[PDB]
Write a protein that binds this ligand. Structure first.
Ligand code: MG
Ligand code: NA
Ligand code: NA
Length: 327
DNA sequence: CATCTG
DNA sequence: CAGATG
């Protein structure tokens, strides 16, 4: 946790770089388990050879750890922290919609910058376009003080369109957090489920409304169950308008709301532990359901959940207010 | 995993 | 349809 920090970090840099610049998935994937194992490792890795000793730890990584341990640095690491090529790929990628893949093309075309992008607004696709347009706003965290207003907003519109809607804002916002990075609303309706054959309108009608009233500004992607967009709190009495914020809306069949809701609320850490315990308690958990774990090895059959309560109960656990779902 | 591009 | 993104 700090005993092998630098090690795990450099390894991180290293891995990262393989996947993103080079297309080195194998290698990349290599650095990964390695930093993972050295991570769990209990003592102070005083040397390469010592580390080698670990699974996932071969000759090259060892060699690396050595140089690093021997000197406060790594050449290759330093060669990579320079190379404008490597750097550009790390940056272009900050643009929502631009992945590595793309980040590569652009560079090999000479687009290595924000300006490069603007000038070449043509090569960019819609999502990337927006992405570009809101670069700044996209990076700005979301203070709960807005979050509350936002939520206040979605909730009132979802309601008006249908009394039967059930909206929920998950995420860290849901978990207490003072600021979040994007709004994520869970959504269901009684009239939509596991079996029930579809109802796209279920998702579209609302989406509409939100943009009706102008909360939704752009559309990144809008499928029949997942909508990815841009929103923004109405700038009051002109002087101070709000940043544009990322937001996603997802339709969920009423029969798996809470698991989805539970799940989305996180944290990851709250998850696993929740997951792991459920396993003990003779169960199974994932995004949509909870299943009584048979003995023959495994087994399914969606136990019935009417609230986050119904879940905990199942695994016979202490109901956790969203706040305390931290770890 | 769902959506989009081309 | 593969392949990319979030
Ligand atoms: Mg968040
Ligand atoms: Na990106
Ligand atoms: Na292939």
């Amino acid at each position: 946790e700090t005993l092998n920090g630098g090690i795990t970090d450099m390894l991180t840099e290293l891995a990262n770089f393989e996947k993103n610049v080079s297309q080195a998935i194998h290698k990349y994937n290599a650095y990964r388990k390695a930093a993972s194992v050295i991570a769990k490792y209990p003592h102070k890795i005083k040397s390469g050879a010592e580390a080698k000793k670990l699974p996932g730890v071969g000759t090259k990584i060892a060699e690396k750890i050595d140089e690093f341990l021997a000197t406060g640095k790594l050449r290759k690491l330093e060669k990579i922290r320079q190379d404008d090529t490597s750097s550009s790929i790390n940056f272009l990628t900050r643009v929502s919609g631009i992945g590595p893949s793309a980040a590569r093309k652009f560079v090999d075309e000479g687009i290595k910058t924000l300006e490069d992008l603007r000038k070449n607004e043509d090569k960019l696709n819609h999502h990337q376009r927006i992405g570009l347009k809101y670069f700044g706003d996209f990076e700005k965290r979301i203070p709960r003080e807005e979050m509350l207003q936002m939520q206040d907003i979605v909730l009132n519109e979802v309601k008006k369109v249908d009394s039967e809607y059930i909206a929920t804002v998950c995420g860290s916002f849901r978990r207490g957090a003072e600021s979040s990075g994007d709004m994520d609303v869970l959504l269901t309706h009684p009239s939509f489920t596991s079996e029930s054959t579809k109802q796209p309108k279920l998702l579209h009608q609302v989406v509409e409304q939100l943009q009706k009233v102008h909360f939704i500004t752009d559309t990144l992607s809008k499928g029949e169950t997942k909508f990815m967009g841009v929103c923004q709190l109405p700038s009051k009495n002109d002087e101070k308008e709000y940043p544009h914020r990322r937001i996603d809306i997802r339709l969920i069949p009423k029969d798996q709301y809470y698991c989805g809701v539970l799940y989305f609320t996180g944290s990851d850490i709250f998850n696993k532990n929740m997951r792991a315990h459920a396993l003990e308690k003779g169960f199974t958990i994932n995004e949509y359901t909870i299943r009584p774990l048979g003995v023959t090895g495994v087994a399914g059959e969606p136990l019935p959940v009417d609230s986050e309560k119904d879940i905990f109960d199942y695994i016979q656990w202490k109901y956790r207010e969203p706040k305390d779902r931290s770890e």
